[PDB]
Structure 1
Amino acid sequence: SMNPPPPETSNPNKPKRQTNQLQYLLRVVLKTLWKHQFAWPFQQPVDAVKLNLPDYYKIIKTPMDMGTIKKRLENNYYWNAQECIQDFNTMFTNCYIYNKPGDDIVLMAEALEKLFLQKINELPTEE
C-alpha cells in the first residue's frame, strides 16, 4: 500500500546527450500526448494510496509516467531516443498488465499510444 520513491529523473554520473531525436521526443511526441483529453491519469506517478490500489506496486515493478518522462527530457537525462521510447512503452504496457480490456484507463492509454505510434513513425534521422 505505500508508494515507492518515483523513478530517477536526475543522476549526474549517468551519461547524457541532447540530440535532434530526443528534441523531437520532447517538442513533438511528450507535447502531443501531454495536451490530449486522456493525458491526465498519466501526467504523474500512480499514487497507490490516494487511488486505493494497494496491489499496484506488487504487480508493476517498472513504473513509468509522462511526468517522469517530461522531467527526464527537460533535464536531459537520456543518452538516446530508444531509452525514451522504452519509457513510453513501459507506461502503456504497465496499464495493460494491471487493468482489463475495455476499462476506461485502458481506452485512455490506447488513445495516447495510437498518437505515440503516429509521431514516432516520423522520428527524424540522427544528424
Structure 2
Amino acid sequence: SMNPPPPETSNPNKPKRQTNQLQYLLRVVLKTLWKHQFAWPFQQPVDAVKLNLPDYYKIIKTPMDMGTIKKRLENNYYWNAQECIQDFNTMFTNCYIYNKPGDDIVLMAEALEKLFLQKINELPT
C-alpha cells in the first residue's frame, strides 16, 4: 500500500499530562491555525494516493499533520508543550523537505509557520 498507517494519536505505554500550556496549544494555537486559508493541506495525514504523491513517504519518514496533533491534544497524548510544538515543527519542516522553495504549498506552510510562531511567542504560565 502506498500509504503508511497514520501516526498514533494514543499510546497506553506513554504517560499523559494536561497543562495550561497544552490546553492553550489546542484552544488557541491549533484551533486558530485551523481556520487559516492555508490550513487545508495540513488538516490530515498526507494521502499519497489521493494527492498523487507516490514518492512522498519515500522521502518523508516522520510525517505529521494538524489533524494528528489535534487528536493528540484531545487525547492528552502529550507530556508537555514542547512535545506538541516539536510536532508542529516537524509538520512544517516536512513540507520544506519534500517540496522546493517557492512552491505554492511551501508558501502556505511559510505563512502558517509565521502565524504559529506569533502565537507560541507567549504561552500561559
Name the TM-score class by shorter chain: over 0.9
How far apart, in 2, do the equivalents of 1:77 and 1:19 lie? 12
TM-score if structure 1 supplies the norm length? Answer: 0.96
1:73 to 2:73 alignment: yes
CA-to-partner distance for each residue in 1:48-93, whole Å, 9 max, x for gaps? Answer: 0111111100100000000000000011100000110000000000
Kindly state the Cα deviation for residue 40 of structure 1 after the two structures are TM-superposed: 0.5
Over the matched positions of the two proteins, sequence identity in percent amounts to 100
Q: Distance in 2 between matches of 1:9 and 1:24?
A: 19
Residues 71-124 of structure 1: CA deviation (Å, up to 9, x unaligned): 000111000001100000000000000001111100110111011000000112
Work out the CA distance in 2 between the residues paired with 1:119 and 1:50. 32
Secondary structure (helix, strand or coil) at the match of 1:15 reads coil
Q: CA deviation at 1:19?
A: 0.3
Secondary structure at 2:101 match in 1: coil
Aligned with 2:34: secondary structure? helix
Deviation at 1:11, TM superposition (A): 0.7
In structure 2, what is the Cα distance between the partners aligned to 1:105 and 1:18? 33
Shift of residue 13 of structure 1? 1.8
* TM-score for the superposition, normalised by structure 2: 0.97
* Alpha-carbon distance, 1:32 to partner: 1.3
* 1:30 CA displacement: 0.5
| CA shift for structure 1 position 8 | 0.5
Provide the rounded CA distance (Å) in 1 between the counterparts of 2:17 and 2:91.
23
The 4+ residue runs of structure 1 with deviation greater than 3 A are: none
- Which residues of structure 1 form unaligned runs of 5+? none
Instruction: Give the Cα separation in 2 of the matches to 1:93 and 1:3.
Output: 20
C-alpha displacement of 1:44: 0.2
Distance (Å, rounded) in 2 between the aligned partners of 1:52 and 1:117: 30
Identify the residue that residue 18 of structure 1 maps to in structure 2: 18
Distance 1:115 1:121 in 2: 10
RMSD: 0.8
